[PDB]
């Protein structure tokens, strides 16, 4: 039972940690989306300029 | 520190070993007390 107690605590903490990685992925995806919008606008302007 | 969690598990098992041995000794002592009470009554 001591071994289950340790296992349960570790697994719960690991899930809590994984949530942080999910948050990091979401934030970086938002930044990448902003960069993508800028790139598409630049592409359209290059089309208009050539 | 390298390999922390395995060392922590080793320490936890090492203290569990001592606790289990102590509990076994408690059971033995209780059995001894019971036998001594019976022997005293009979004598």
């Amino acid at each position: 039972a001591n071994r289950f107690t340790s296992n349960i605590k570790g697994l719960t903490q690991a899930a809590r940690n994984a949530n942080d990685g999910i948050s990091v992925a979401q934030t970086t995806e938002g930044a990448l989306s902003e960069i993508n919008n800028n790139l598409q606008r630049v592409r359209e302007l290059t089309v208009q300029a050539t | 520190t390298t390999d922390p969690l395995k060392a922590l598990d080793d320490a936890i098992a090492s203290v569990d070993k001592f606790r289990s041995s102590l509990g076994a000794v408690q059971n033995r002592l209780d059995s001894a007390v019971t036998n001594l009470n019976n022997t005293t009554t009979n004598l």
Partner: peptide
């Protein structure tokens, strides 16, 4: 236990690392 990791890769994204360094449409 130990070594229970999921690897996230992060790539440096900027003008230099995208080929758009010095991009001009004029002289």
């Amino acid at each position: 236990n130990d070594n229970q990791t999921i690897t996230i890769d992060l790539k440096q994204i900027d003008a230099k690392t995208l080929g758009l360094d010095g991009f001009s449409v004029k002289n």
